[PDB]
Design an enzyme around this catalytic site. Structure first.
Site, PDB file in Angstrom:
ATOM      1  CG  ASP A   1      -1.973  -1.247   1.009  1.00  0.00           C
ATOM      2  OD1 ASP A   1      -2.372  -1.381  -0.021  1.00  0.00           O
ATOM      3  OD2 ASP A   1      -2.373  -1.762   2.132  1.00  0.00           O
TER       4      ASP A   1
ATOM      5  CE1 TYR B   1      -7.215  -4.512   3.339  1.00  0.00           C
ATOM      6  CE2 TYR B   1      -6.756  -2.325   2.449  1.00  0.00           C
ATOM      7  CZ  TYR B   1      -6.479  -3.610   2.415  1.00  0.00           C
ATOM      8  OH  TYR B   1      -5.714  -4.245   1.676  1.00  0.00           O
TER       9      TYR B   1
END
Ligand SMILES: *[C@H]1O[C@H](CO[C@H]2O[C@@H](C)[C@@H](O)[C@@H](O)[C@@H]2O)[C@@H](O[C@@H]2O[C@H](CO)[C@@H](O[C@@H]3O[C@H](CO)[C@@H](O)[C@H](O[C@H]4O[C@H](CO)[C@@H](O)[C@H](O)[C@@H]4O)[C@@H]3O)[C@H](O)[C@H]2NC(C)=O)[C@H](O)[C@H]1NC(C)=O
Ligand SMILES: *[C@@H]1O[C@H](CO)[C@@H](O[C@@H]2O[C@H](CO)[C@@H](O[C@@H]3O[C@H](CO)[C@@H](O)[C@H](O)[C@@H]3O)[C@H](O)[C@H]2NC(C)=O)[C@H](O)[C@H]1NC(C)=O
Ligand SMILES: *[C@@H]1O[C@H](CO)[C@@H](O[C@@H]2O[C@H](CO)[C@@H](O)[C@H](O)[C@H]2NC(C)=O)[C@H](O)[C@H]1NC(C)=O
Ligand SMILES: *[C@@H]1O[C@H](CO[C@H]2O[C@@H](C)[C@@H](O)[C@@H](O)[C@@H]2O)[C@@H](O)[C@H](O)[C@H]1NC(C)=O
Ligand SMILES: *[C@@H]1O[C@H](CO)[C@@H](O)[C@H](O)[C@H]1NC(C)=O
Ligand SMILES: *[C@@H]1O[C@H](CO)[C@@H](O)[C@H](O)[C@H]1NC(C)=O
Ligand SMILES: *[C@@H]1O[C@H](CO)[C@@H](O)[C@H](O)[C@H]1NC(C)=O
Ligand SMILES: *[C@@H]1O[C@H](CO)[C@@H](O)[C@H](O)[C@H]1NC(C)=O
Ligand SMILES: *[C@@H]1O[C@H](CO)[C@@H](O)[C@H](O)[C@H]1NC(C)=O
Ligand SMILES: [Ca+2]
Ligand SMILES: [Ca+2]
Ligand SMILES: [Ca+2]
Ligand SMILES: [Ca+2]
Ligand SMILES: [Cl-]
Ligand SMILES: [Cl-]
Ligand SMILES: [Cu+2]
Ligand SMILES: [Cu+2]
Ligand SMILES: [Cu+2]
Ligand SMILES: [Cu+2]
Ligand SMILES: [Cu+2]
Ligand SMILES: [Cu+2]
Ligand SMILES: [Cu+2]
Ligand SMILES: [Cu+2]
Ligand SMILES: [Cu+2]
Ligand SMILES: [Cu+2]
Ligand SMILES: [Cu+2]
Ligand SMILES: [Cu+2]
Ligand SMILES: [Cu+2]
Ligand SMILES: [Cu+2]
Ligand SMILES: [Cu+2]
EC number: 1.4.3.21
Lengths: 671, 671
Positions: B329, B414
């Site tokens: 990420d 998320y």
């Protein structure tokens, strides 16, 4: 309430019943001697689960309200201690020894915990007949005076070296006013042999002073005025934490305050607390400690019982006391040593506070005000949350507000904090913290392998803390199975490029059928996902279970080669699951304390080849950690990071996160 | 404020300066095409520690306020992406290409993240070239009207199989409005080889639809029309948490909430916060995420910096996309994806909210409201506490109140909640949670190796979450050492009764001298009491230090046999400790994500055999866990007990518990 600890009145009737049946030779245990017959305790005797459940579900007639009273029988040739069940309340009629029935035979008299009275006699014998023989030395080092008791003693456990003993080592401390004396060990420890039914025959087996062993105070005293005993003068007063608890700094701006804008959203109706999501009854075991039964989330019962079972604390030491102390706090009783909660410090200033009536070492029921406190705490953290700016702008979430039930047990030096958190997510959290005063000894020698110096002449003794909990889950019913899911990487070729390789992540699921393959020793690895589940599936076709997640840093349990290691066999595991039996209601005994060599109750005897596949199971969790004292443990040990325990989280139990249906849940679009 | 993030003016100043010195060929990266030249990002280049400290706590001249800008050079024969450090803000002057200097060598273009433009360019290729070729199939299974594009795609990572690639796998989901589209996989995933510099050159190398692999959209539509594709119709609507995010149940009695009775005890000016107890500077890295500098407890700096360094989410599953997703990420940007905080949910109402400015994939800097939130939280639990009923009846407590700095990043599905809580004890806690939505796939076949079924035709893909943090402490000076203290039972006969055996509890104090000694692989036992210490001791002669208590259940990191493992080598550690070298400022790079096979920043290289004794050290903590999706993750995954991190606790760093001096401490006697 079928699980409401005996009432103020109920206790009275059991006692009135007993004074009548036990003959008149019965004495108040508050001032009884080894040779007297006295009632040590009387509290709620838990009802059998079968009848208990039948009443709550079918509606069937509830079992009988019984009480368990331990009576010390010293008024007889062969003295014993016995467990007698009395009832049925509120108007008793029967009574029945169950001792032999429960423990195979007679409960040896030496196992009986030390009576309040019994302690005084020891100080009596110490400050009166003993300490005087060494007044010379004392007049020097410790300011002993021709007045007395400017010093205090502190017990340790177990008493002795082999089964059948009652030899306790007592450190001596300065009787500090309004602050812990625990931090001011004068350097003298005495091994009192108080096994005789006659206090006249109690003796001093050995004495330890500032480093060396002496056969008697006299011999020591002798050598002191002889000139061969070098004394390190211990100051009797000072400043700072080592000396006071009163903060020198004056208040400033008030700390954020918690408050219910529309009032409490829960309701403690006696022993039963009821809120929007949860409902349960609570209590306190005179010895076992905090306990909660019949936990229903939105009506459905998840747990029949989640109770504290025991508390251990094994010490490493510089001196004989520390060196052999292996406290088994239930031997003292977590219920009994439950200190009243201070409104505003121990619990949010606007929490509900409940009382606790008890009948232990006395003949008339007394009460502990604010033994428990129940309240709602807005965590500051969100339960669920998602900010979307991709494809469709919207926001949906829920700030988490929990429901806590607290109680504190102050055994001598430290205070235990028994927290039971009820999450909006249907998850249950159990935590306990060790705070207050640490046990310190006299500092002499190389501070290497027993602790650190936390203050002049005072040594933070190394020790392990460990608590055991009974978690009688009844996930979607009584018959549950234990599953163990985890992970693994399987090397295999790429379906769309067999020229390349990939590490295929897969789940590893295994069924635990034998109690043994479900018992996990402290140290060895455990499945990342472990849980008890029902036979039945949740909407998406998965067995409805509840996962058990632990938070332990538990030290290593006493080696097995230790003969007392059996007195607390539960400490050797992180977790074990067994067939919850009626003859296995506890994992330890109040008696185990004074005689760990010959356990009244050995937890390892709960693990035998038995199927834990479709039976009424009960999980046993052990949480704990090593505590090497340090400066910032003065005056008190903080709770930060030191709060261990575990979680009960739903896993395919609900068809979806019920919090979706939270009234308080929030939603909108964009900003 | 030398650690404070760059603001509009400054970013503008740099951009203005960039478009000037960079010349003509410089398109707005927002639309910029593969073979274009554009400024991908302009961020704050962190100052050299030495000079930073030189000035900060001495008087020396503050170091050159810099900003690191990344440019994708595509409009050239040899396309490279370079890191350029811009001149002295606020009025820029110079520019240096640190690419070789810094990473040593040229940055291969294919490592450049996929611009928000390339994504559009892709969707065009999908909807306006491919998807119609299966108009028949879609018009059936998926209500697919070529009209309005009711479906959305979702990128994965890494892109490719071996290095040098750029072939992503996109799953297609319904464009649900106001909820998560992640719970609605239509069974169709695609492999877009968007490697080339010219969008037309791109192609679909393989397609995956409801189970089978096909060669082209045409081949699928053909077999569908032929009759050899038994489609399972995915409902495009429905109710419950799988469709809605808004609770159905109306608002009920309002939930409790805090508030500062006499206002807040802490101020916020820029990026620096300060309270009676704490002092520090916060901020946010574009890819690095949350960071904090110059943490001083009552003036003493404990940490030079504590920042997030990377985030990872390794997946498993039966679908190609899932089956091979390993999200680094940071290749997306935790700062970059930081979404706005919703007052009263993400953070308490009475908190201080802060903005964040940035020049990312744009030519104009934009701001994110309430990116950070700082507040004070009465925990509703006591910090230290002792109630005395033995000898002297006094009581001393202090309910704990903590200081919090929060920020939330939303990487597609998320949202990560980044915490950092400063406690009144001088313990700094770092926790991060994963919430929001999961990533689902189309359900089919023998389900059990890749996840549980959480909803109609959708599987909860098994995955692992991990996050690396750079904790660069400076325990009362730069010279810090690593101590590993831990217990052990040593048997020796009972001094006073040799006939009897004893298990002597002792502590082991070993010093870690090499980096290798201090680097701890995941899944391996670590020293209970592990900490970094100074040379200097406290008033009781023990080394002044801080211990690193970890809180993680890190699932097994991706094997080493795997070609990509090196791209996130840190995932293979729980903790590691090294020499704070300015050239080892980060454990991962934004460029690692698209080239895991050729890491831009290999963390295993930070661990060479160098002495970690009396040097400036920095610890690298890794916390994470395994996530096996279950029904309760719908609509969102809850934070409850899923927050992992660690604590930085004072260990013999103080002469005592610094909270003894709390102005808010409590004391008294009796009731
Ligand atoms: C999960 O299981 C429960 C209970 O099933 C138990 O089955 C026994 C045999 C054990 O293996 C135990 O471990 C299981 O938990 C489900 O509810 C009951 O399910 C059982 C089947 O497993 C039903 O029992 C059957 O009942 C019929 C008549 O009603 C009997 O004739 C059957 O047994 C005959 O055959 C054997 C072998 O020849 C002989 O030994 C017997 O004497 C009989 O001749 C058999 O026992 C039972 O009826 C169910 N409960 C009722 C009465 O409703 C539960 O539903 C299941 N949950 C799910 C959804 O998986
Ligand atoms: C612990 O000591 C108690 C002493 O109270 C033991 O209980 C006592 O048991 C004896 C034996 O049954 C009872 O003796 C009585 O003897 C007369 C003499 O003939 C007889 O007529 C009576 O019917 C009765 O049996 C005594 O009442 C009873 N006392 C009580 C209150 O229990 C007990 O056995 C010892 N515990 C164990 C585990 O051995
Ligand atoms: C990446 O490309 C840049 C292009 O700017 C190279 O650096 C410049 O190169 C030109 C001539 O090609 C010089 O006139 C400039 O002074 C250079 N400065 C800049 C902007 O860097 C650079 O060498 C290349 N770097 C890599 C990764 O190979
Ligand atoms: C602690 O270390 C300080 C700096 O460390 C170096 O300096 C000497 C100690 C030398 O032996 C090197 O090997 C060390 O790594 C030093 O300047 C201080 O005097 C030391 N202070 C104490 C309390 O010993
Ligand atoms: C300890 O001293 C206090 C006063 O200093 C007194 O109230 C208490 O009774 C004493 N107890 C003992 C054990 O001497
Ligand atoms: C301890 O010292 C303080 C100040 O030096 C003094 O005020 C106090 O009386 C002493 N403790 C007691 C109560 O004897
Ligand atoms: C457990 O019991 C079985 C009998 O059912 C026996 O065969 C086996 O050897 C035992 N295993 C253990 C725990 O030794
Ligand atoms: C999804 O629906 C929203 C509703 O306005 C629309 O704006 C958006 O373009 C759609 N996204 C897709 C399918 O690309
Ligand atoms: C789904 O159906 C509901 C009717 O219950 C409608 O309001 C909604 O628009 C439909 N889905 C969307 C948002 O397109
Ligand atoms: Ca058993
Ligand atoms: Ca059960
Ligand atoms: Ca190094
Ligand atoms: Ca450092
Ligand atoms: Cl792989
Ligand atoms: Cl031992
Ligand atoms: Cu009833
Ligand atoms: Cu005996
Ligand atoms: Cu002294
Ligand atoms: Cu009451
Ligand atoms: Cu937004
Ligand atoms: Cu018993
Ligand atoms: Cu402790
Ligand atoms: Cu500690
Ligand atoms: Cu400055
Ligand atoms: Cu390339
Ligand atoms: Cu701003
Ligand atoms: Cu009191
Ligand atoms: Cu870089
Ligand atoms: Cu997850
Ligand atoms: Cu979960």
């Amino acid at each position: 309430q079928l699980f409401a600890d005996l009432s103020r009145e109920e206790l009275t009737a059991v006692m009135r019943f007993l004074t009548q049946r036990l003959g008149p030779g019965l004495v108040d245990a508050a001032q009884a001697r080894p040779s007297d017959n006295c009632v040590f305790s009387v509290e709620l005797q838990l009802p059998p689960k079968a009848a208990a459940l039948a009443h709550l579900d079918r509606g069937s007639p509830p079992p009988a309200r019984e009480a368990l009273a331990i009576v010390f029988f010293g008024r007889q040739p062969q003295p014993n201690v016995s467990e007698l069940v009395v009832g049925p309340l509120p108007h008793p009629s029967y009574m029945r020894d169950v001792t032999v029935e429960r423990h195979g035979g007679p409960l040896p008299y030496h196992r009986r915990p030390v009576l309040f009275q019994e302690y005084l006699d020891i100080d009596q014998m110490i400050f009166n007949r003993e300490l005087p023989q060494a007044s010379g030395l004392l007049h020097h080092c410790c300011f002993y005076k021709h007045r007395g008791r400017n010093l205090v003693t502190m017990t340790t456990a177990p008493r002795g070296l082999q089964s059948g003993d009652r030899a306790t080592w007592f450190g001596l401390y300065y009787n500090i006013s309004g602050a812990g004396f625990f931090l001011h060990h004068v350097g003298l420890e005495l091994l009192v042999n108080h096994k005789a039914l006659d206090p006249a025959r109690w003796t001093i087996q050995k004495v330890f002073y500032q480093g060396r062993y002496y056969d008697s105070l006299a011999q020591l005293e002798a050598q002191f005025e002889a000139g061969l005993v070098n004394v390190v003068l211990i100051p009797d007063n000072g400043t700072g934490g080592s000396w006071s608890l009163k903060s020198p700094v004056p208040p400033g701006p008030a700390p954020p305050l918690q408050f219910y804008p529309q009032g409490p959203r829960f309701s403690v109706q006696g022993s039963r607390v009821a809120s929007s999501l949860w409902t349960f009854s609570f209590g306190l075991g005179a010895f076992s400690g905090p306990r909660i039964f019949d936990v229903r989330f939105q009506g459905e019962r998840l747990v029949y019982e989640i109770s504290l079972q025991e508390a251990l604390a094994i010490y490493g030491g510089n001196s004989p006391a520390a060196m052999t102390t292996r406290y088994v706090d239930g031997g003292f009783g977590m219920g009994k040593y439950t200190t009243p909660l201070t409104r505003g410090v121990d619990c949010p200033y606007l929490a509900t506070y409940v009382d606790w009536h008890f009948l232990l070492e006395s003949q008339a029921p007394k009460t502990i005000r604010d033994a428990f406190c129940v309240f709602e705490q807005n965590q500051g953290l969100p339960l669920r949350r998602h900010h979307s700016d991709l494809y469709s702008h919207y926001f949906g979430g829920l700030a988490e507000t929990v429901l806590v039930v607290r109680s504190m047990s102050t055994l001598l030096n430290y205070d235990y904090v028994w927290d039971t958190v009820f999450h909006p997510s249907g998850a249950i959290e159990i935590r306990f913290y060790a705070t207050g005063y640490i046990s310190s000894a006299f500092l002499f020698g190389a501070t290497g392998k027993y602790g650190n110096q936390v203050s002049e002449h005072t040594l933070g003794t190394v020790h392990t803390h460990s608590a055991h909990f009974k978690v009688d889950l009844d996930v979607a019913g009584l018959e549950n199975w234990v599953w163990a899911e985890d992970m693994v990487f399987v090397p295999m070729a790429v379906p769309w490029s067999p020229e390349h390789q990939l590490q295929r992540l897969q789940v590893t699921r295994k069924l635990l059928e034998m109690e043994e393959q479900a018992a996990f020793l402290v140290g060895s690895a455990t499945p990342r996902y472990l849980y008890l589940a029902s036979n039945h599936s949740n909407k998406w076709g998965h067995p409805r279970g509840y996962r058990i997640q632990m938070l332990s840093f538990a030290g290593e349990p006493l080696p097995q080669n230790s003969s007392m290691a059996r007195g607390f066999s539960w400490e050797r595991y992180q977790l074990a699951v067994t067939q919850r039996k009626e003859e296995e209601p506890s994992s330890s005994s109040v008696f185990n304390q004074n005689d760990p060599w010959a356990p009244t109750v050995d937890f390892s005897d709960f693990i035998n080849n038995e199927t834990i596949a479709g039976k009424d199971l009960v999980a046993w969790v052990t949480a704990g950690f090593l505590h090497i004292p340090h400066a910032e443990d003065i005056p008190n040990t903080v709770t930060v990071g030191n709060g261990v325990g575990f979680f009960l989280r739903p896993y395919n139990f609900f068809d979806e996160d019920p919090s979706f249906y939270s009234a308080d849940s929030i939603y909108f679009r964009g900003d």
